[PDB]
Amino acid sequence: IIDGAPCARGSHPWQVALLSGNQLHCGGVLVNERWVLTAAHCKMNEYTVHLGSDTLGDRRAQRIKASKSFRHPGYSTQTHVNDLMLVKLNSQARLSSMVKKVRLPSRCEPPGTTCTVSGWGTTTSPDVTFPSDLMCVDVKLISPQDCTKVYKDLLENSMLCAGIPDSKKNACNGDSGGPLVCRGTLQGLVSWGTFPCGQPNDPGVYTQVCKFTKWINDTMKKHR
Ligand SMILES: *C[C@@](*)(O)[C@H](Cc1ccccc1)NC(=O)[C@@H]1CCCN1C(=O)[C@H](C)NC(=O)[C@H](C)NC(=O)CCC(=O)O
């Protein structure tokens, strides 16, 4: 997260991290005791999932191995359309005041809504700096018509743009798959942006969760 501040302690109990061993790979969100939602571009053969602490690296965090994951069938490794994936935990997450299921949306929040995006990704770019504490920034949803002016053919329908005018506040490497929450529901998963991160007036681009709830539910049903 570029130009953020630590998230409020205990306010992100549905945030997880996907690790390669104990190295950050991506963010994610806990959907239920057996499933994490993240970005398809974060696909690996196996993952370690961190839950239950705002401190990445916390010796007391819950850690669960995950062997199985399923990208949206429409995902492209070229364009990153449909950048979402479900990761199946090998054992059930232990829920508590610090480990909670995210609230998936019924509806799509409109342009101009204020939202919060979180993650443990780099706070600097191109030279990286990885934080210990979960970082947050508030960003506003940008309409497709406005966002197309910037990204043109790179933007496809189920991508949602968000940012703050003239601001570096944004997502960056290591934040993918983490949550963009607006008015109490999960509206986005971090997907992509420009490089170096934090260029003013280059929106962050998110998978628009309100377009994928049938696939999310159907896939979880199918796999257990
Ligand atoms: C995987 C996830 O952690 C990461 C999150 C992220 C968010 C914002 C900025 C950078 C990274 N997502 C990515 O790494 C995605 C998926 C692979 C490629 N990718 C990108 O966001 C890359 C960095 N974006 C680009 O290549 C964009 C489309 N082009 C440019 O940035 C060109 C130059 C420019 O205008 O500055």
Side-chain angles (χ1 to χ4, degrees):
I1 302 289
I2 310 300
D3 197 39
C7 302
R9 236 64 193 163
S11 75
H12 282 62
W14 20 263
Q15 175 85 227
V16 303
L18 299 174
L19 316 176
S20 173
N22 288 111
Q23 191 169 82
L24 178 64
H25 188 66
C26 285
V29 333
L30 189 68
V31 165
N32 63 42
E33 290 93 337
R34 292 293 306 272
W35 295 96
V36 164
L37 181 68
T38 188
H41 80 254
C42 300
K43 176 77 178 185
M44 305 196 292
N45 182 27
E46 313 189 318
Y47 318 76
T48 299
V49 184
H50 162 106
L51 318 88
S53 182
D54 300 311
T55 298
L56 189 65
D58 196 324
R59 300 184 291 274
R60 305 182 187 153
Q62 192 177 168
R63 299 167 231 256
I64 306 171
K65 189 187 149 179
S67 307
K68 300 174 175 99
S69 60
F70 306 94
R71 295 176 313 174
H72 190 277
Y75 177 63
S76 170
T77 57
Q78 183 187 212
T79 68
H80 307 289
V81 70
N82 303 309
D83 193 10
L84 76 164
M85 177 175 68
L86 277 164
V87 172
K88 192 176 185 170
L89 301 179
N90 288 359
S91 62
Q92 144 172 127
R94 294 215 298 130
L95 300 187
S96 70
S97 66
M98 296 274 316
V99 180
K100 301 185 181 180
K101 305 179 207 76
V102 76
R103 180 174 174 203
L104 293 174
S106 61
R107 292 176 282 217
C108 308
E109 290 287 345
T113 302
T114 298
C115 309
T116 303
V117 57
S118 53
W120 294 281
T122 185
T123 61
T124 59
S125 186
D127 294 316
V128 299
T129 307
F130 284 99
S132 72
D133 296 306
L134 188 67
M135 302 294 180
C136 273
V137 71
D138 288 4
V139 293
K140 288 176 190 344
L141 299 187
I142 297 162
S143 74
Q145 25 274 118
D146 283 343
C147 199
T148 54
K149 296 178 192 121
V150 179
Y151 290 136
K152 301 161 179 158
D153 191 52
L154 293 173
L155 284 169
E156 315 212 3
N157 314 19
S158 60
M159 293 176 189
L160 172 65
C161 300
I164 296 290
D166 288 327
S167 177
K168 291 198 85 72
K169 286 176 173 59
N170 226 140
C172 198
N173 301 267
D175 291 322
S176 290
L180 179 73
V181 296
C182 318
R183 296 187 187 139
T185 64
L186 184 70
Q187 292 287 314
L189 305 165
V190 173
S191 177
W192 61 271
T194 55
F195 184 85
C197 304
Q199 294 180 238
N201 303 130
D202 284 353
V205 190
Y206 300 78
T207 301
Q208 192 179 20
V209 175
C210 69
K211 301 305 176 62
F212 296 98
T213 56
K214 183 179 183 252
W215 176 81
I216 294 165
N217 268 223
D218 284 342
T219 299
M220 292 181 305
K221 180 41 226 184
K222 172 170 124 184
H223 294 276
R224 236 31 246 197

